[PDB]
């Protein structure tokens, strides 16, 4: 994993460059929006369990996936569903603080589309629950912070489809 700072040091290190004016622009962009990210990271951490309760109620709680024979039928199947939404919300907050989507490829999306196909989990329903969690969060934290969190929700959705 690398954040917005480590991402700029690593890209200049493989070229042998001192930090020029173009690397200093990317470093200034993160330092300016840095106060906005520590504010949303503390607002999502305190409403973590109730964000996913409201995001499931808007997408999957009132479909028929929980009907007998569905994926989310048993209690074990239902408890594992909401544990993933715990994963996606917690790893999209690591990505919004770092300012880099690098941690999602390393610790989330690695072999995940094959894991859902082996188990039978609907991929399009998970993307629909993530799109609801993206909308529930964008109203809690605001428009600027909510538009950054929605940048790393789309990254999990694109790497899952």
């Amino acid at each position: 994993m690398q954040d917005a700072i480590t991402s700029v040091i690593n890209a200049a290190d493989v070229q042998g460059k001192y930090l020029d004016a173009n690397s200093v622009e990317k470093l200034r962009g993160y330092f300016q929006t840095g106060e906005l990210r520590v504010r949303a990271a503390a607002t999502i951490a305190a409403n973590a369990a109730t964000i996913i309760k409201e995001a499931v109620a808007k997408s999957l709680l009132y479909s028929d996936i929980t009907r007998p024979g569905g994926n989310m039928y048993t209690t074990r199947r239902y408890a594992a569903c909401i544990r993933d939404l715990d994963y996606y919300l917690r790893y999209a907050t690591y990505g919004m603080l770092a300012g880099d989507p690098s941690i999602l490829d390393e610790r989330v999306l690695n072999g995940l589309k094959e894991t859902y196909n082996s188990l039978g989990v609907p991929i399009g329903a998970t993307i629909q629950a993530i799109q609801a969690m993206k909308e529930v969060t964008g109203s809690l934290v605001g428009s600027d912070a909510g538009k950054e969190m929605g940048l790393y929700f789309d990254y999990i959705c694109s790497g899952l489809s």
């Binding site: 479909s63 028929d64 996936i65 009907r67 024979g69 569905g70 994926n71 989310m72 039928y73 048993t74 074990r76 199947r77 188990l119 039978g120 609907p122 399009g124 329903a125 629909q128």
Partner: peptide, 22 residues
């Protein structure tokens, strides 16, 4: 495998196709 087990064949839910009028 176990007692409550998932299979594509015994899944009559509209969960793999998002027909949201059902």
């Amino acid at each position: 495998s176990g007692y409550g087990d998932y299979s594509y064949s015994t899944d009559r839910t509209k969960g793999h196709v998002n027909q949201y009028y059902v």
